[PDB]
Symmetry: D2
Subunit: 234 residues, 4 copies
């Protein structure tokens, strides 16, 4: 999405606590193709909606956008631990009372990167630190388990070849991207793709796994982004 | 997404079979903030990828993009029939062999606008003409059923109040949108929201249902879009 | 089971309200091979446990054994209605809190002669008058449904060929039974077999269905039983 | 069941390879109340059906009844191992094609003394040596697991208080039984009750567990049975 708000977000990536003047944002925001007009209305809208804060020195991210940005990055690189063959297992022992509730359970299993072995059985390696999200996910039985073909299990819980194929296609898309606006759109795709990363331990990763490639390409784009903003600043 | 490709799509909405010159697209594409550069590279990319066709008279949609556009609109207004209390029911009697397969079944139930009553039981009123998608969904038992509290059932299969609340928020977003780029982003949200419309018959629709409001606002935006392109053409 | 209690039950079948003297029961009970001893201790035990009542004129069934006997017979011949293609459907929407509870639900579905289409979906033709057993089975959604291959559905909910094969084997067992004690044991098998009868309407019954044969053979044995007790009485 | 066949089975318990003459069986079989008649017809029927073998020295069990008797006893005392917290877990990943098939899977899980945690998840401690019964149970995924409240899990997989209550009632029934025919019927109940024993390891057994009491009472009855047959023999 090459929309005013999400592009000032990218242009400000890693700026905080430094402040960025309107003038500077006008400059960094234009290779993406938005003159003053749409932008000044956007900055004002964002400040009003709690997304940016303004001062005499200009603009920088809100504390709650900043903490949102921070949780995104510990989701893309969530402390992993060396793995010893154990799986977290969550068995659903209750049917949620309504549709929003059953849908929020799936959304919750996906977010914590569990795969569905089958109706009501979700698993993942215990290399991520499972914390059960209070009540909402209270109604499951938590077990630890082990499998004798864990690479096979992994291949059964997630579509590994499809996620691999999709990742390589995004690497090709970046290689082929032609301007900053093109690189930007590909990076937002890559972020959306990592969000679904099953975050598998070393031993279970197939050798054509694109995870590291996708992180490097995203961090290269974040670096080029931050560098443009020092060029203009200094 | 205010990206080069998806905005030439919107600018060409309903043009076909008429052709649009580069010059004309440069003009219609600029209030969205993209001078020649990004655009000419986009038009060329799209033609190469099979999305547009070019001629001496300029550009118009591909036959396969056109048929894609057409299937989107019979999905947003899919012939409904006056309803007589019957539900389509699909009982899954087979577990799909792999993750891509079980995921494609959910994606397939959602696309045909079935709600999940519970693990393996999907239903909807028979006001849409169910056609079972060949093999892939072969492995279900098809029944017709009726409920004594069908508005209650409907409220149990879908999050109706949440879809209502989300729809009204999008109407408010349009009312508040400030330029064509803002209206465009809100319209793409509305299209994504209608895609999930449970398409309920009259008798089951709650009176604060935003469906008609959301269709009118989308069709108003499509109309303003088509009108801009006659202004420039003539 | 050719045990003292269950054989005085069979010997008294249909006696009530008439009374049977010890002497008479000694006579009717002996071709089954139990002299006074085991019997007098049994009669006394049964009276003490609330199964028989005694008087100066002897013994006859308890009112609560009688009502138990009566509910057995409206279970073996439960008013059926001419059928019009509709099925009762019970969808379980709640997981029972404990093992006794989930087991009692299965036991309850079997008793009301529902078949399990698949996990949590139970059905049967609506030719039996479903009454939901208060609370215990409160936690299901009740629908009516129809299938386009209802004989096929029936064959999928119950093992029809196996129940047919088992029934014929019991008819052969009766034909081959050699004395009253042998006929008695075969009749108790037949009663246990009918208890599981899916009670299908006419249109769905295969022509080698042994139901009527099994009822006639049971009612022939009940008749021979009642006749022995008039022979001795008069 | 105090029927001719099942009582010659009990009277012959542990006789094999010794032979028992008609005369001797007439003597041992009569306190149960069956003179020559029913018996000689039974012995002949059993020999014909492959249950007994006869010779000039009389009768003794068939090799296939003997191996059946033997498998019953390694089912009532199936080598257990000192337990270390691990559970066998069987996840069903396939729906069986027909009713006889889905019913045989439940019957198979019960026979190997697995409890159903919930639809498609069966578990038990690994103190019994699970062997998967070839094909028929091929279609499950086998895992090992551990729980943090394993006594609680055990209480959730089986109705432990109900099985305890039923066991004590059978101990009371034996204490109260009045003759050999009464003791016999109670023993057959106890055998049927042990068949369902969850065979829990030491650490998970509640202290009012009736397992050992039920085995002692059965083995006391088997001993009294074998002793009667030496009294008559010698």
């Amino acid at each position: 999405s090459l929309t005013a708000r999400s592009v000032v977000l990218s242009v400000l990536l890693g700026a905080h606590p430094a402040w960025a003047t309107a003038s500077e944002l006008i400059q960094l925001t234009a290779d993406f193709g938005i003159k003053e007009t749409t932008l000044r209305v956007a900055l004002t809208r964002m400040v009003g909606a709690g997304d940016l804060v303004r001062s005499a020195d200009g603009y920088r991210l809100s504390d709650r956008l900043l903490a949102r940005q921070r949780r995104q990055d510990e989701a893309m690189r969530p402390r992993t631990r060396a793995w010893h063959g154990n799986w977290h297992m969550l068995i659903v022992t209750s049917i949620g009372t309504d549709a929003r509730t059953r849908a929020a359970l799936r959304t919750c299993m996906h977010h914590k990167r569990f795969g569905e072995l089958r109706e009501g059985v979700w698993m993942r390696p215990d290399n991520l630190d499972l914390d059960l999200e209070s009540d909402v996910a209270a109604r499951v039985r938590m077990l630890t388990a082990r499998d004798e073909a864990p690479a096979d299990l992994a291949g059964q819980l997630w579509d590994l070849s499809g996620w691999t194929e999709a990742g390589h296609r995004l690497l090709g898309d970046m290689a082929a991207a032609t301007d900053m606006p093109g690189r930007f759109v590909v990076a937002a795709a890559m972020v959306r793709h990592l969000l679904t990363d099953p975050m598998l331990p070393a031993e279970l990763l197939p050798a054509d796994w694109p995870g590291a490639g996708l992180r490097a390409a995203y961090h290269d784009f974040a670096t080029a982004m931050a560098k443009r903003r020092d060029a203009t600043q200094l």
